[PDB]
Design a protein around this ligand. Structure first.
Ligand SMILES: O=N[O-]
Ligand SMILES: O=N[O-]
Ligand SMILES: O=N[O-]
Ligand SMILES: [Cu+2]
Ligand SMILES: [Cu+2]
Ligand SMILES: [Cu+2]
Ligand SMILES: [Cu+2]
Ligand SMILES: [Cu+2]
Ligand SMILES: [Cu+2]
Lengths: 302, 302, 302
């Protein structure tokens, strides 16, 4: 019989603590879907559909071999059903059927995390593209039995493309636009659901000399990210989120409904900006994040 | 001179028998190009230009070092010249010049399969994009001298984007639309030339516990696939169809005019759906396939 | 202190000589930004913004551990300031802040090439996407300490998407078009700044039997290249320009703001054309280059 443990999940930029256990366990996770109106950009509002109050949903972290027990609830105020498809899960719809939950209801189901990796999870209620485009996606990290190398700083980042009826900048509550979605012409492309969610006062933080690891997901719906950090180079890249590691990469592809893990040492102070290098998305649509590094200057590097 | 062997090619979902020989051979392949009107979707017809009657063309399977002798016939009823560019072939146009065949003629030529891999082959008659967009592509698997591991189930899948003058859903015979193709705005994105070609009654089949390997090609012309199988995880991925193997990947990029090889064990019964995870293509344009798995339920997994 | 060496930088198709030194050095590089009108296609002119007179800029080649000193000059006739972000550099904007140069001014700065790889460098003056779209980008190769394997032929290739107000073919001077850029709908997609820059009389050259290496960049701004050479197969691919080597690949993804290194032996005469296999870009938008190989025929290969 398997041990029962409550999972530690985090709201985004934050990542749960590393797992210090060398045996399988039943990990209980609680998730709620809530529809709410939030700021997309200055003077722009959007009706997001979320996993636990924001975009992306809370990061889940378990160990290879663990059984993940999910208590899935859909808030009474929701207008449509919601569920969840874990790319980390093996079986019918990644758990979608088992978690189909009408508003004001609760569903429970479990699945075994048979393989390590960094997996996207997202709502799969029809129409699928709309539920995803409204913000229903997050990440679940399944650590290898032996764990991952220790690192000084960890960040949870998820890129998504959004389709607004009005063009980028149009004030007020902007409705989801089906036509632009099908045509794959988003108005906003962002990290963690909103323009500036990880920039300015919300910038990520690290200290010079610290090793950094970013768990980068791409919830889509449609765009593929040419992920890059201005002023830095990826020492390591877990290609497409898998076991294969590449090194000295400037820009990595993060598939739609996919992920990547990148690591780099920030040996010099300054502001590093995360971007989808399909450039106009970054400087015109909002795909821009910042990692502010405090510390002391080294002219030998620059 | 080498031992002669008549190639066994398969119409799509099916893959030819694995190669169990450790010596080079002259493999005789016969291909015919035929233009025909077929159903793209319910009430929607399209004039396809095909390699052997459907999209994709018949899968070819040879061994690294083999000499592939192609007898290329262009059906008498064709209205334009056709040829073939084998990405597996080294030399002028991948064989296109040597296989330029007018309607009612048969061209013969040969090429040595110098390197193992999973290669796209397609027509290259001007205008190249049009011949490809009308459905002229397939895959040729060149096995390594040592062969490939035995697997229980092998499937032949090729994604393609189609450009219809009318919008998706418009009834009747829909002509090829050059303007949409250049702008890279397809109306249909499908697996194996037709909406549902691999779904419903045409779903792929396997039994719980079987090892599965999918040879995934992307004939384009333009889209790049974020290939994924809902409810499953790729144990192995031959990155971009080459020698490099990744593991535990949820979604892999299949380059336009490229491929990928993914493997996974289907340990639990259910319906698994193949999709391009640039999501709207899958649930709005037709990039959706199904693998039905019969067998007995394991709750420990889900 | 470090020996000072004037760098050899090459205008594109050409690559600087391999680095034959096993000790670090201070490599002096001179770069000038100049805005000039040039031919994009027959009867079509475009106002390019360039690093040293053309697109891409001159290729820089240094050794891991080298200190790169840059003397950056913005020509008096320029209408806006320019600078440079080296993806090879670690620190604030890859050197963008330190190289912000007004017209008629000169700036100097230096950085240590801490990691080997093939890096894109580009202007980063707001609006960033426009400075890149007008042609401001190039490559800097940072060799590994031990160097790279000897190869018979080396080529400098950089893809880029351009956005013109008029559609492809419209005669006269065509201004940059922001709306098409944001929507990611280029009119021209080319290798080395102009349609035909590497084709016809400008084709690359090699002899049968020679080993070839192409340093492939993708300055974007927005597209991702499914890079392929018709009639050839990539023996080796430095995945996304990093350390990881794939083999037997027909087509590789070159990320926006990213690169790749491909190698192949041209064992038979003929014309091999480089293309972005998102096919219409190649045959309709200009993403087409040629490598003409002289020598004698080998029927055994084809
Ligand atoms: O170097 N990033 O635009
Ligand atoms: O998990 N596929 O939508
Ligand atoms: O194989 N070139 O389209
Ligand atoms: Cu939902
Ligand atoms: Cu999914
Ligand atoms: Cu044809
Ligand atoms: Cu091709
Ligand atoms: Cu500039
Ligand atoms: Cu950049």
């Amino acid at each position: 019989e398997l041990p029962v443990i409550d999972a530690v999940t985090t709201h985004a930029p934050e990542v749960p603590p590393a797992i210090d256990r060398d045996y399988p366990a039943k990990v209980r996770v609680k998730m709620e879907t809530v529809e709410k109106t939030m700021k997309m950009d200055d003077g722009v509002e959007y009706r997001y559909w979320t996993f636990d109050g924001d975009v992306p949903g809370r990061m889940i972290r378990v160990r290879e071999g663990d059984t993940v027990e999910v208590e899935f609830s859909n808030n009474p105020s929701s207008t449509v059903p919601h569920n969840v498809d874990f790319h980390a899960a093996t079986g019918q719809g990644g758990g979608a059927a088992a978690t189909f939950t009408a508003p004001g209801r609760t569903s429970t189901f479990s699945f075994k995390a048979l393989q390590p990796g960094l997996y996207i999870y997202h709502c799969a209620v029809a129409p699928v593209g709309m539920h995803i485009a409204n913000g229903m996606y997050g990440l679940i990290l399944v650590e290898p039995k032996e764990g991952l190398p220790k690192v000084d700083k960890e960040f949870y980042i998820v890129q998504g493309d959004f389709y607004t009826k009005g063009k980028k900048g149009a004030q007020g509550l902007q409705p989801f636009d089906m036509d632009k979605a099908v045509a794959e012409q988003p108005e906003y492309v962002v990290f963690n659901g909103h323009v500036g969610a990880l920039t300015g006062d919300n910038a990520l933080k690290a200290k010079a000399g610290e090793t950094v690891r970013m768990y980068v997901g791409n919830g889509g719906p449609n765009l593929v990210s040419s992920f890059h950090v201005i002023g830095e180079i990826f020492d390591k890249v877990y290609v497409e989120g898998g076991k294969l590691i590449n090194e000295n990469v400037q820009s990595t592809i993060v598939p739609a409904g996919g992920s990547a893990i990148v690591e780099f040492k920030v040996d010099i102070p300054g502001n590093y900006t995360l971007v989808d290098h399909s450039i106009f998305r970054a400087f015109n649509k909002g795909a821009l994040g910042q990692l502010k590094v405090e510390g002391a200057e080294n002219p030998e590097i620059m």
